[PDB]
């Protein structure tokens, strides 16, 4: 009966909500728990996925832990992307449910990248990596791969506890007080203005009905504390603004309503609405930092808002990002300047981080195999430090390999010529990346199949999903050499191994580095060849 | 002009007057007669 409470949404919300806390509660027994953990999920399997949004955010904050609790939400998240997945991946979306707002798409971006690390860093646990077995796998099909976030910049920061540094040690401007002074008194003048638009003029008389401030009298009647402590909100942005090395310039160094409107319409560039966006979420720390040393005398049932500015839902930021660009605007044309990469949307694409990772780990895959050979050749080391990352490796990133390159085939083979997929077509990087990344699984699995022991099987079956994704025409036609001389070094290695096989076969050799080369053969290589040459010809 | 305080909590009534015999057509905006007006030929018909 939820499915249709487009209208209670936001009591739905609160629910989920209770129920997701009760979940997360001392003194309830495993039966108790299980309960509450039952209805949640049932919940939200019938929920739209856009109601879902608030806890999705409350999730991406608790579960990148992975403690205890992290198991079930593991869970619900897994069954919740599987089901909703062309909510957020394709563009049209499910009908009646609609499309994703872009916040959903940055939330599922920072699930995705948090989980990830977190698993990587941990120590393996069987069952959480069976947890996450059904895996980021979800969560990385429903976020399309040319998914672009506004902001791709490192949080560099963290229950949550935001600590600022205090400078107060060091002197303040006094010009910069009275220019905050005179900005005060300008933002008196606008807010009359404000009052002027709702029509309502402040007035003379008293009366709270009418919701007219009484206190409006001439400036010089004020009494002098108000002024100061009506200003230390602003002093102390500022403040915090200066202290966290944002450096103020002067651009050009020294030697009856109002007529301008101060209005949006001037440029910004997409790293200066970055720092307006980090500059407000300062701003916003320190309003939740004195929000917290207030409540903290309760002790207890944090107000769930209270969050990172930018991760809440963009709604919010038009007012502090509006005052940050008048702000800014203003103290550029007087001429104090205030100043704190580059990357372009291929780079921000979700797919293009991932290969990156995928890559590294390819090359960590060398490193430590090459240490491995060698201490098996003397000096051999049984402890084997690495076991945390091979385990990260066979059990993650090869079926989350799989099922992602499986699902989004069609947008790697896609050109603008042709696009087999829906949506989108993957770019010359993302390309070069993922031929960069089969040759570096063929070369790893070369001769190594032993090695890898039970999880060769599904390194062969890697490959060929990956076999199916390249396109080579555009790599080899323009591509690096650098992946273009892999992709030669594979086919000649194969050729190579296929020669030493037929002569052993010839028996020549009197049958070790024969039963190596020919099981690496037979169960590796001729097949992913096969399948290689299939989809050359295909 | 309200581009200050766009919006009016009044309610806003157009009134349409057709003489038949003469073909004119003139309006009110709130009992205050506009500008506007027409002249149509006979034997128009006019829908509201």
Redesign the interface.
């Known amino acids: 009966l939820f499915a249709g409470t487009e209208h209670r949404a936001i009591m739905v919300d609160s629910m989920l909500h209770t129920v997701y806390r009760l979940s997360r509660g001392r003194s309830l027994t495993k039966a108790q728990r299980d309960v509450i953990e039952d209805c949640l999920m049932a919940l939200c399997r019938y929920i739209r996925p856009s109601m879902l949004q608030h806890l999705l955010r409350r999730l991406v904050f608790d579960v990148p832990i992975l403690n205890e609790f992290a198991k079930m939400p593991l869970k619900l998240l897994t069954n919740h992307y599987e089901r909703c997945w062309k909510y957020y991946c394709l563009p049209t979306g499910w009908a009646n449910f609609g499309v994703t707002s872009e916040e959903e798409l940055h939330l599922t971006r920072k699930l995705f990248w948090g989980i990830f690390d977190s698993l990587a860093h941990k120590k393996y646990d069987q069952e959480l990596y069976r947890m996450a077995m059904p895996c980021l796998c979800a969560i990385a099909g429903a976020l399309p791969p040319d998914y672009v976030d506004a902001s791709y910049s490192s949080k560099a920061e963290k229950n949550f506890d935001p600590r600022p540094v205090e400078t107060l040690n060091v002197i303040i401007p006094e010009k910069l007080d009275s220019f905050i002074n005179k900005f005060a008194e300008y933002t008196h003048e606008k807010w009359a203005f404000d009052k002027?638009?709702?029509?309502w003029s402040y007035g003379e008389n008293v009366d709270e009905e009418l919701k007219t401030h009484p206190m409006l009298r001439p400036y010089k009647t004020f009494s002098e504390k108000d002024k100061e402590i009506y200003r230390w909100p602003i002093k102390e942005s500022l403040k915090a603004m200066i202290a966290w090395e944002w450096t103020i310039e002067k651009a050009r160094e020294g030697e009856y309503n109002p007529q301008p409107p101060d209005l949006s319409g001037v440029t910004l560039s997409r790293e200066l609405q970055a720092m307006a966006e980090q500059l407000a979420e300062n701003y916003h720390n320190t309003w939740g930092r004195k929000k917290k040393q207030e409540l903290e005398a309760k002790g207890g049932g944090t107000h769930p808002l209270l969050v990172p500015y930018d991760t809440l839902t963009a709604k919010e930021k038009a007012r502090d990002r509006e005052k940050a660009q008048e702000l800014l605007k203003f103290l550029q044309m007087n001429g104090y300047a205030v100043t704190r990469l580059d990357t372009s949307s291929i780079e921000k694409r979700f797919a293009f981080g991932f290969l990156q990772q995928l890559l590294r780990w390819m090359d960590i895959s060398q490193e430590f195999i090459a240490h491995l050979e060698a201490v098996v050749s003397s000096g051999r080391v049984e402890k084997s430090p690495h076991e945390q990352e091979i385990k990260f490796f066979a059990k993650i990133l090869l079926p989350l390999i799989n099922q992602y390159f499986t699902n989004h085939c069609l947008y790697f083979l896609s050109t603008p010529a042709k696009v087999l997929g829906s949506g989108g077509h993957a770019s010359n990087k993302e390309k070069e990346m993922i031929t960069s990344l089969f040759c570096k699984l063929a070369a790893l699995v070369r001769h190594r199949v032993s090695l890898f022991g039970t999880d060769a099987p599904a390194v062969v079956n890697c490959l060929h999903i990956l076999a199916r994704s390249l396109d080579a025409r555009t790599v080899m036609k323009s591509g690096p050499e650098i992946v273009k001389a892999g992709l030669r070094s594979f086919f000649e290695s194969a050729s190579e191994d296929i020669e030493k096989m037929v002569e052993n076969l010839r028996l020549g050799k009197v049958s070790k580095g024969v039963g190596q080369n020919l099981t690496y053969t037979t169960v590796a290589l001729l097949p992913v060849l096969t399948t290689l040459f299939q989809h050359i010809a295909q | 002009p309200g581009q200050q305080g766009r919006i009016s909590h009044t309610d806003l009534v157009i009134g349409c007057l057709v003489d038949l015999a003469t073909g004119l057509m003139t309006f009110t905006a709130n009992g205050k007669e506009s500008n506007t007006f027409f002249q149509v030929e006979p034997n128009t018909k006019l829908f509201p």
């Open positions: 002027i638009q709702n029509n």
